[PDB]
Every structure is written in C-alpha cells, then in structure tokens.
Amino acid sequence: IISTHLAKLYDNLLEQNLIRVIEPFSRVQIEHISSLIKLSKADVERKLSQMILDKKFHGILDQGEGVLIIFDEPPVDKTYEAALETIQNMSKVVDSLYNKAKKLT
Amino acid sequence: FDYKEQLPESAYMHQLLGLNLLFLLSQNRVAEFHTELERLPAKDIQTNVYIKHPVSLEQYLMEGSYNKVFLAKGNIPAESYTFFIDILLDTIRDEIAGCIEKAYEKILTDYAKKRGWVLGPNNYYSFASTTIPSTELAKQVIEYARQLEMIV
Amino acid sequence: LPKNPDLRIAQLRFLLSLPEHRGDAAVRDELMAAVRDNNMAPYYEALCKSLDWQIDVDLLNKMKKANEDELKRLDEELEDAEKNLGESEIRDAMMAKAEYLCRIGDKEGALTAFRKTYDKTVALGHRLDIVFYLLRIGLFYMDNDLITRNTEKAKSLIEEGGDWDRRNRLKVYQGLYCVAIRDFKQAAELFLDTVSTFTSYELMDYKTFVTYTVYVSMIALERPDLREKVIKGAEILEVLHSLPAVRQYLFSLYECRYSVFFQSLAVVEQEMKKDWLFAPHYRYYVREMRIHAYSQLLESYRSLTLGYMAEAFGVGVEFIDQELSRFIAAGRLHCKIDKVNEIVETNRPDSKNWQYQETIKKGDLLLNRVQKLSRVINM
Amino acid sequence: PPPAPQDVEMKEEAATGGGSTGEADGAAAEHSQRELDTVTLEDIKEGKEPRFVLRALRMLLPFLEEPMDTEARPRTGKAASTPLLPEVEAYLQLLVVIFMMNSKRYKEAQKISDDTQNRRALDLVAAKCYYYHARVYEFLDKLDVVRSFLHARLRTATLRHDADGQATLLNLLLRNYLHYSLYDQAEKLVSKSVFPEQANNNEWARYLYYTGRIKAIQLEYSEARRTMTNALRKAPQHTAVGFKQTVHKLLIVVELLLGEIPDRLQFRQPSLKRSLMPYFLLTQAVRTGNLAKFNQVLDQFGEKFQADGTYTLIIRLRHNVIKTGVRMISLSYSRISLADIAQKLQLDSPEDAEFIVAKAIRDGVIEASINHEKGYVQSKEMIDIYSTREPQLAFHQRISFCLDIHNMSVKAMRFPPKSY
Amino acid sequence: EKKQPVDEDNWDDDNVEDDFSNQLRAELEKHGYKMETS
Amino acid sequence: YLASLIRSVVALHNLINNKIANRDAEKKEGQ
C-alpha cells in the first residue's frame, strides 16, 4: 500500500504535473521542472495513463509536445437528442408498417 | 446482322472484324470497343488468333501499354493486319501529360518540340504545376424553396 | 446437477485428433470411462472411428449383458412400478433407466427414454432437471438443435417458480453455449455470476471457469467496466492468484506492460487452440486482441514514430508495419500510417463530428424505410 | 375427390369477375389490381375449366371460340386474356401454344379496337399477355413482330394513359441477343421516358436490372453500382431460386471490378451458395492477387460466367486486379515509398511503379500528387472533413437533398380520395 | 419476377476467416520465434 | 450546419406524422 501511496504521491505530484502542464502549452518533453528521466518510461509516464480517461486533456505528439487541447464543445445535445428521436421514430415507422400491412391484408 | 442462315463462314469475316476492333481502339471509342468484343463471344474464347492481337493490345492499354506498346507489336508482327497495326502505332497515346518532366524528370526532342513542346498545352513541365458571399446567393434560393413548399 | 455425461471424455475425444499420439494421456482414460457407466455407444463410436481394441470388446460386450441386466431390471422394476398402485414410481424407474442408457449412449438415453419421462411430469422441478439433463447430453455431442430446444424449454415455463440454483445453472449453461459460438458480449455478461458457480459437473473446476470468464471479459468488456468488474472481483482475484500466468496476462494490458502482454497472447493462443469448445475461434481471439492493444496504445498519442512501437512491442519493425497496414485496410485501428517519415496519426472523433456521420447513417435507413412504405401504400 | 378442390377454387373467379364488371362503369386501377393478383395466384394453382368458362353472361379449342360465337366489355377482355392460363401453367410446349397466340392476337385485335377503364384494366393485362407472347416466343425463338407492335403502341402509351411494361419487353428483345445486340440499348437511352408512377413497382426494378447490365457492359461502374443496388432494394418478394442470384452475380462482379472487396457476411443466403460459390472463389483469389489461382478458378469454372453473360467481364477484371489491390495501398498510407509499393504489389521495378501510379492518378482513389523525386508517392488525402467550411457543401447539400426528399409529404396530402 | 431458372456456427464470421484465411500459418507463435530471432 | 440538421429532423418527423394522418386514417374502404 505504501507503493500505492508512492504512486499516490506521484498522484499528488500529478497536481504538480498539472502545474507543469497548466501554465504553458507544454511542448516540452524536458522534465526538468520535476525530477525524472526525460523518457522515464514514456516521460513521466503519467501522461500516457492520464491521457486515457482521467486526463489532462492533451494529445501528445511523440516529437515533443503534451499540448493541452481543452474539448470545449463535447456536450452538444443536438446530436444525442436527434439520434434518440430518430431511433424512436423508426420504431414508430415499423409499427405503422405492421399496422398498414395488417389493415390492407 | 442479317439472319443469312446460308451465310458461309469465311476466314475474312474474322480478319475484317478485328480491323474494326483495332481501329475502334484507335478512335478512342473504348465503350464501342468492348461493344464489339461482346458481339463475338464465340470468336474470342481461345481460338481465332486473327482477333487475338487487338484484345491483347486492349488489355495492355488498360494495363501499361505504354511499356507494352512495342511488346504487342513484337508479340506477333502480322495477323493480316500489316497496315491495320500501323494506325494504332502512329496513334500513340499521350495521357501521361498529367506528370512532370522536362528538367524535372527529363524522360518518359521532337516530342519536346511539338507545338513548342509535348502536345502544346501547359508550360515547361519543370515549371508547369474560401468565400461565403458567393455561396450567399446560391444558398438564398435554396432556403426559399423549402419555404415555397410550406405554402400549400 | 450430476456428472451424467463426461465433459472430460468429450475434451479427450476432441483433443485426440492432432496430438492423438500419446495414447497414455487420453486413450487410457477413455478406456476407463468406457468400462465405467456402461458407456456402450461412446466407446463403440470411438472404436469404429480409429481403434479396434480387438479382444478388448468382448468384455465390453460382457458388461453389455450387465447393461442388459439393468435393462431387464427395467422390465422388472417397470412391472413392479406398473403393478404398483402408486403413481410416478413407473416414472422414476423409467427415468433412472433412461439415465443409465444416456450414460450408455446417446440415442437410447435420448429421445423417448427421456422424452417419455418428460411426458409424465408430476414435479415441475423434476422435469426441469430432466430438461437440464437433455441440455447437458446435447452439449456433450454438440447437438445445437437439442441445445436450443432444451434452452427454450427451460427459459419458457420451466423457469417459472422459485428455483434460484436452477437459474444459476441455466445462466452458466447459456454462457458456455454462447462461448462455443463466436458471440462474446453475451458470454461476458452472463459470467457475472462467478461468485456462485458451485462446482458444476460441466466445468472441469472453478479455475477453468474463471479463466474463461477473464478471457471473454477482456475482449467484450470495456476499460472502465474492465477495472470495475474483473480487476476488483474479489473471487476473481483469488482465482487469478491461483493461476499466475493468467493473472500476469490480465494485468499486463491494464498496467500497460506490452512485450510481456504479447508473450501472454502467444501462450494463451496455444492453449486456446489446444482446448475444446473454444479452439475453433482462436484466430478471431488473437486478431481481436491485437487490434485492441494497438487501439489502446495509439489512442493517447496524436502522432507516433514506429520506432516507439517497436520498442514497446518486440524489437522487430516490419511486423508492426505490416500489421498496421492490414488492420487499417480492414477499417479498424482508426489511424493513418505513413512511410519515409515513419509516423502515424489519429483521425476524427466520434462525438466531435462523427456525430453527424452517425446521424446521416441512421437517416439513410429511416429514409429507405419511409420510401418503401410510401411505395407500398401509394397503390 | 378431384372435383372438390376445383369446385371450390374455380367459382370465386365468378365473384371476382362480377366485381370487375360492376366497377368497370364505376372506374379501374382501384379494384383491378386485386383481381389481377387473384388471377396470378390462380394461375400458379391453375380439365372442366374450359367448360365452366362457357359464356358466363349472355344478356378446348371449340370451348375457346364457343363463348363469343354464342350469346355475348372489360370482363370479355379478361376472359379472352385468361383462356390460355391452363396450357400456360401446364406449359404443354406443343403447337397448342401456336393455338394460343391467335387468341392473343385476337385479344390484341380486340383490345386495339377498344380505345379509359380498358386502359386501366385491359391495358395492364396486356402486360401479362405480352409476357405470354415472350414465353411462347423463347419456347420456339425470338421474334420482333411483338417488337413492331410494341413500337407502334408506344404512341398510344403516350396518350392519356401509359404502362411501362413495353420498356421491359424491349429489354427482353435486347437480351434475347444478349451480348450481340448493343445498339438496342443505345436507342433505349434516347427513347427513355419517365413512367414515374411505377404503379407495378416490379417493372421498375426489372428494367433497372438490365439498365445496370448494359451500363456495366461499358464498365461505367460509378453509376452501375448504385443503379444495381437500388434495383435490388425493390424486390420484397421471395424471388429466390435462380431469380435474384443473377442480379447478385452481376452486382458483385461489377463491384469486384471496380475495386471494392465484398465479404459473404453481406448476403450468405441459404439458397444462393450452391450457385454463387464460384464468385466466392474468384473474389477470394482477387483479394490476395494470386494470378495462378485466378486462372485456375477461371479455367475450372469456364461455364456459368459464359452461361451467365458475364465471361467477358471477369476476363477483363483479370488485369484490373492490380488496380483493385492498389486501391487499398493508396488508402492506407499517406506518403508511400515507390520502391516499397512496387515490392508489395510485386511490380517490375521503380519506373513501372511510377507509371502505374500515374495511370491510377485518373479518377477514383485520392490524388497521389507524385513529386517524381524522393517524395515518390505522396497520396495526400484531403483533410478538414469536420462539418466545417471544407465540408460546407459536403455536409450541407447532403442534408438539403435528404430534406427536399420530403415531397413524400405533399404526395401524402394529395393522396386522400375521401370518396363522397 | 419468375422467368429465371439458374437455381457464429457458419455465419457472422466469414469476414474474420477470409480476412486472414491465408494466414494463421504462424499461429502468432512462429511469429514469436521470428520476432525473438531479430 | 446546426440549422440544417434540425431542418432534416423536423422534415422526417413531419413526413411520418402526415403519413399516419394519411393512409392509416384515409385508407378506410368501409366495405
């Protein structure tokens, strides 16, 4: 569990890792701000795992980057509601098809 | 085309037919070229060497006839088409124009001099080769059409 | 419920095709089973298939007389139950005889032998048990029709009533069947009940079941649900503790150990081919996991040098190049390779604009449906 | 016992005819279609019928010409159009067909003199009598007398009412020669009409099939694919046994020629494999590019394609395979090494690969923009496809059409008859 | 239409098999051998 | 793009609704 704490400390340092990646647009694989190998298992290596899901919201480039992107327009309810409405409407259309087939024959 | 059940088959029929076929490719009526091909399914098959040369040429044309230009010529020097092959040969394809040469590739004089050079269009191949408001007018009409439907 | 058939025998029979050279390993136990439960038809089938056994069938025929004795006992007990005033005693006697037959062989045990018992069903639980017996025997011989019919019988009405253990057994049976088929989402979901699996006769033991559960989940399940279910499954954790290699394989992907992950993929592919009821799909499994690993690794990076992949994976570089090319061509991996520069990029997001793509996709189908309806109704 | 099935089945025809007559003066196209369907599925069901059709109202062969000779209009036309159904279904194939066509000619003479309730029932049953003409034809041989009469009747079709079966019959004449008659479709191009009513809805798909065929003959895949697919869309009926297998064969061979690689997971219908597996073999060979295997399968399955009127198409694809393969390579990468692609496609050498790429620049796979230098093959696909300006038209006009197709609405509110 | 003579367990998987039907010669294990040989 | 997306949605919905108010209700032969 101490190890988990150690990664937790790195997890706590993740905030400091947030510091390194909040002021600039990153673009520095030089981890001089912290104290770790420039390629310490893929740089800090937290960016990789962090980039998955619980992320700094960056893209990384593998040529030197870590550029934060900031997805400012994910929640556009247009798409979700339109898709759901189309699904239910096609269900209704199938129902009407059955009704018309039965009524005609 | 005439039924002509009595029509006695002659070796000329096959020879002459290929001449059209060879010419048809010459006049870049490729659609017509296949049209004739499908008219003689029993001829082409595997026999009828007379008409076998053009089809090989056509295949080479859809494939790289440019390299195979002289391969088919050497495949059979003559098939009673001594002149027939001549028209095709002198009608060298030049679709390769969509590329770069002339001190940019340098290979593919008289060709480099024809109509000044190559066939004439463009320039020296080494040196050869957004707006909403314009969209505004076109879109405006489209939008009204949708409204026009909602009239009645 | 009981070890009516021998899934071990079935596994040996299947595996006795390519590596049938080690007679000690498989043929000896098969003979033991043949001399056990009076399994006449199975060993006769195995005989006619490959081996003769010569003299070592007369003694089998001798126990056939023993089976005949049991068969004769049937008559006796039959009449004893038939003359007996009490009802359902004939039913129990003939059910026992049919059980002895089914261990003896498929056809005799199957069919009326059980169906007739299923005709007279005083007890709902008893007939549900007979249905389960039919399902098990059908699975042993890979009788898809029988499997479907038994499943329909169980889930249609036999399911009605309070029988929880029956529900668990039925869920496990459906899961195993779906595993035999190349559909994995259903199997992964159905193996949720890994907490309460008893020690079912069908499965060799708990370990094999958990191994199948982890395998199916690691394909069907998704990363969040992956960490939630398999990674935190207490009993799952104990089981994988029992089996080290599987544990390392599972954790390798989640913790992003890739070279060892590929070694695990190789060994598990070998085992997958070796086994029965799963082997026919090994190629699909391996290719799917390769696709998954590539997709996971590439997701983080918007750009990537193939040298990095080579380092992360095995040293070689041609393998990753050709595999990426193939999968890109197949339409997976949602990337775009490049040469000379030796870089790989990402592509459009699903929710960014592919929202519009999906909307148009669904709209096309809706439009076709409405058009056909209009044509039909418009006389 | 045999009479009872007949005694129950051959009497409802009288009720149907009574309804047809009653509505004749009402007028047609709203009741006729049901009677035509009943006629069809009676024909599939098919003695004493010639005697029972005796002059139903007053005020084999001798049975054929007895009624009108006896005490004697749309009903008369229908009776004259359905005395040949017995032999038709029985398909005696004897001269009795030569006894049947005169009834058709007499019916043709009868109907021509009529004229429009006739144009709404007799005109359409003219379609099935033409079907029988063609059947009676192919039984012996093709003939253009039907073609001449059809061409003459085109002008009448240009009158108040129009059926489109005539185009189908003209295509039948074309296909009779098949690969031999290619000027016929050249005519059909200009002679093409609208016939948008599509009232039959089966003639439309039928003609679309052969339109796709002729287009494919000239290798115009870009539109041949869509027309063939749309035709296949309009085929709700079973039409399985040897009916749609030809359409599928044509569509899949055309697609393979174009460059797309299909997979049997698409169709894999139970009643197709036995007849369509040769295409599976050839497509499997193509996807890889094993020329030796390709010629092996070709010479093994010499027939079928020869008998399916598609041998030439596969023979020409035998060299388009290279383009088919190169499509994928061009799609995958974004900056290709010419030598490497040459190795991948087992090409001769770098200049050959460069020439092949140039030949492939034409139209189709995303531009290559070969630089003729170290860049080799660029194949820089267009980017910015994000519902943004770059797909301004791309992701606007698509929706514009998808919504302008809402004319289904105006059709719907223009349909209600609301009788009385 | 008529007038036309001519004429998972086994489905939902043709694509997978055909895609690599040629391959599987290495079973990912000969692949491992070749890989380590590097 | 957003305006045209909602336009397509409303067009489809209007189509279905008007069809139902159509034949479903208009196709009453009533013997």
PDB file of C-alpha atoms in Angstrom, chain C residues 54-154:
ATOM      1  CA  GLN C  54      -9.941 -56.479 -30.745  1.00  0.00           C
ATOM      2  CA  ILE C  55     -10.375 -58.907 -27.816  1.00  0.00           C
ATOM      3  CA  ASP C  56     -10.931 -55.872 -25.617  1.00  0.00           C
ATOM      4  CA  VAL C  57     -14.509 -55.603 -26.770  1.00  0.00           C
ATOM      5  CA  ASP C  58     -15.848 -58.993 -25.653  1.00  0.00           C
ATOM      6  CA  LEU C  59     -15.504 -57.958 -22.021  1.00  0.00           C
ATOM      7  CA  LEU C  60     -17.221 -54.732 -23.030  1.00  0.00           C
ATOM      8  CA  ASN C  61     -19.922 -56.880 -24.595  1.00  0.00           C
ATOM      9  CA  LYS C  62     -19.928 -58.767 -21.298  1.00  0.00           C
ATOM     10  CA  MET C  63     -20.843 -55.593 -19.438  1.00  0.00           C
ATOM     11  CA  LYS C  64     -23.351 -55.059 -22.229  1.00  0.00           C
ATOM     12  CA  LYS C  65     -25.057 -58.088 -20.712  1.00  0.00           C
ATOM     13  CA  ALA C  66     -24.706 -56.238 -17.415  1.00  0.00           C
ATOM     14  CA  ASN C  67     -26.442 -53.343 -19.138  1.00  0.00           C
ATOM     15  CA  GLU C  68     -28.954 -55.904 -20.370  1.00  0.00           C
ATOM     16  CA  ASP C  69     -29.351 -56.980 -16.751  1.00  0.00           C
ATOM     17  CA  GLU C  70     -30.071 -53.357 -15.894  1.00  0.00           C
ATOM     18  CA  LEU C  71     -32.330 -53.279 -18.941  1.00  0.00           C
ATOM     19  CA  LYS C  72     -34.004 -56.436 -17.672  1.00  0.00           C
ATOM     20  CA  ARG C  73     -34.208 -54.828 -14.240  1.00  0.00           C
ATOM     21  CA  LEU C  74     -36.044 -52.032 -16.033  1.00  0.00           C
ATOM     22  CA  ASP C  75     -38.719 -54.512 -17.084  1.00  0.00           C
ATOM     23  CA  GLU C  76     -38.816 -55.921 -13.565  1.00  0.00           C
ATOM     24  CA  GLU C  77     -38.928 -52.530 -11.886  1.00  0.00           C
ATOM     25  CA  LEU C  78     -41.248 -51.331 -14.640  1.00  0.00           C
ATOM     26  CA  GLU C  79     -43.761 -54.069 -13.895  1.00  0.00           C
ATOM     27  CA  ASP C  80     -43.096 -53.675 -10.178  1.00  0.00           C
ATOM     28  CA  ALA C  81     -43.904 -49.995 -10.596  1.00  0.00           C
ATOM     29  CA  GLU C  82     -46.584 -50.813 -13.173  1.00  0.00           C
ATOM     30  CA  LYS C  83     -48.278 -53.359 -10.921  1.00  0.00           C
ATOM     31  CA  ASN C  84     -47.628 -50.989  -8.015  1.00  0.00           C
ATOM     32  CA  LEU C  85     -50.708 -48.868  -7.366  1.00  0.00           C
ATOM     33  CA  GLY C  86     -48.623 -45.789  -6.567  1.00  0.00           C
ATOM     34  CA  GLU C  87     -48.231 -43.361  -9.454  1.00  0.00           C
ATOM     35  CA  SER C  88     -44.962 -41.785 -10.648  1.00  0.00           C
ATOM     36  CA  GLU C  89     -42.984 -44.829  -9.475  1.00  0.00           C
ATOM     37  CA  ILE C  90     -43.047 -46.043 -13.065  1.00  0.00           C
ATOM     38  CA  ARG C  91     -41.901 -42.533 -13.951  1.00  0.00           C
ATOM     39  CA  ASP C  92     -38.943 -42.627 -11.566  1.00  0.00           C
ATOM     40  CA  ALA C  93     -37.988 -46.141 -12.655  1.00  0.00           C
ATOM     41  CA  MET C  94     -38.025 -45.263 -16.350  1.00  0.00           C
ATOM     42  CA  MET C  95     -36.166 -42.009 -15.678  1.00  0.00           C
ATOM     43  CA  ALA C  96     -33.434 -43.998 -13.930  1.00  0.00           C
ATOM     44  CA  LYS C  97     -33.339 -46.474 -16.808  1.00  0.00           C
ATOM     45  CA  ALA C  98     -33.053 -43.602 -19.288  1.00  0.00           C
ATOM     46  CA  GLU C  99     -30.213 -42.129 -17.234  1.00  0.00           C
ATOM     47  CA  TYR C 100     -28.375 -45.448 -17.345  1.00  0.00           C
ATOM     48  CA  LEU C 101     -28.979 -45.549 -21.093  1.00  0.00           C
ATOM     49  CA  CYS C 102     -27.765 -41.985 -21.660  1.00  0.00           C
ATOM     50  CA  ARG C 103     -24.543 -42.804 -19.884  1.00  0.00           C
ATOM     51  CA  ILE C 104     -24.653 -45.940 -22.035  1.00  0.00           C
ATOM     52  CA  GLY C 105     -25.184 -43.999 -25.257  1.00  0.00           C
ATOM     53  CA  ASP C 106     -26.885 -41.034 -26.852  1.00  0.00           C
ATOM     54  CA  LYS C 107     -29.822 -42.378 -28.841  1.00  0.00           C
ATOM     55  CA  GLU C 108     -31.046 -44.914 -26.293  1.00  0.00           C
ATOM     56  CA  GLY C 109     -30.754 -42.440 -23.431  1.00  0.00           C
ATOM     57  CA  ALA C 110     -32.044 -39.564 -25.539  1.00  0.00           C
ATOM     58  CA  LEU C 111     -35.431 -39.491 -27.248  1.00  0.00           C
ATOM     59  CA  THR C 112     -38.425 -41.169 -25.609  1.00  0.00           C
ATOM     60  CA  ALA C 113     -36.173 -42.633 -22.908  1.00  0.00           C
ATOM     61  CA  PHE C 114     -36.107 -39.115 -21.516  1.00  0.00           C
ATOM     62  CA  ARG C 115     -38.963 -37.588 -23.507  1.00  0.00           C
ATOM     63  CA  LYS C 116     -41.351 -40.216 -22.154  1.00  0.00           C
ATOM     64  CA  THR C 117     -40.289 -39.337 -18.621  1.00  0.00           C
ATOM     65  CA  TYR C 118     -40.804 -35.708 -19.613  1.00  0.00           C
ATOM     66  CA  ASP C 119     -44.278 -36.675 -20.823  1.00  0.00           C
ATOM     67  CA  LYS C 120     -45.309 -37.596 -17.259  1.00  0.00           C
ATOM     68  CA  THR C 121     -44.122 -34.718 -15.051  1.00  0.00           C
ATOM     69  CA  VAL C 122     -45.754 -34.712 -11.631  1.00  0.00           C
ATOM     70  CA  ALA C 123     -42.995 -32.439 -10.291  1.00  0.00           C
ATOM     71  CA  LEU C 124     -42.019 -29.253 -12.103  1.00  0.00           C
ATOM     72  CA  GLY C 125     -38.549 -29.331 -10.578  1.00  0.00           C
ATOM     73  CA  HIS C 126     -38.037 -32.929 -11.659  1.00  0.00           C
ATOM     74  CA  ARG C 127     -38.939 -32.208 -15.277  1.00  0.00           C
ATOM     75  CA  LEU C 128     -36.731 -29.115 -15.228  1.00  0.00           C
ATOM     76  CA  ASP C 129     -33.947 -31.432 -14.081  1.00  0.00           C
ATOM     77  CA  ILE C 130     -34.704 -33.769 -16.980  1.00  0.00           C
ATOM     78  CA  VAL C 131     -34.519 -30.774 -19.312  1.00  0.00           C
ATOM     79  CA  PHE C 132     -31.124 -29.883 -17.863  1.00  0.00           C
ATOM     80  CA  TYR C 133     -30.002 -33.471 -18.383  1.00  0.00           C
ATOM     81  CA  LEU C 134     -31.079 -33.306 -22.022  1.00  0.00           C
ATOM     82  CA  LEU C 135     -29.266 -29.997 -22.441  1.00  0.00           C
ATOM     83  CA  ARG C 136     -26.064 -31.402 -20.947  1.00  0.00           C
ATOM     84  CA  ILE C 137     -26.105 -34.526 -23.107  1.00  0.00           C
ATOM     85  CA  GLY C 138     -26.823 -32.468 -26.212  1.00  0.00           C
ATOM     86  CA  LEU C 139     -23.909 -30.176 -25.434  1.00  0.00           C
ATOM     87  CA  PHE C 140     -21.622 -33.176 -24.958  1.00  0.00           C
ATOM     88  CA  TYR C 141     -22.303 -34.341 -28.517  1.00  0.00           C
ATOM     89  CA  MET C 142     -22.587 -30.771 -29.863  1.00  0.00           C
ATOM     90  CA  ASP C 143     -26.290 -31.068 -30.717  1.00  0.00           C
ATOM     91  CA  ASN C 144     -27.228 -27.480 -31.490  1.00  0.00           C
ATOM     92  CA  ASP C 145     -30.882 -28.293 -32.140  1.00  0.00           C
ATOM     93  CA  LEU C 146     -31.157 -30.152 -28.839  1.00  0.00           C
ATOM     94  CA  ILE C 147     -29.329 -27.331 -27.070  1.00  0.00           C
ATOM     95  CA  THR C 148     -31.762 -24.745 -28.417  1.00  0.00           C
ATOM     96  CA  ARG C 149     -34.811 -26.858 -27.588  1.00  0.00           C
ATOM     97  CA  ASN C 150     -33.669 -27.573 -24.037  1.00  0.00           C
ATOM     98  CA  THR C 151     -32.878 -23.894 -23.525  1.00  0.00           C
ATOM     99  CA  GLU C 152     -36.311 -22.885 -24.799  1.00  0.00           C
ATOM    100  CA  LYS C 153     -37.997 -25.434 -22.545  1.00  0.00           C
ATOM    101  CA  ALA C 154     -36.101 -24.177 -19.509  1.00  0.00           C
TER     102      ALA C 154
END
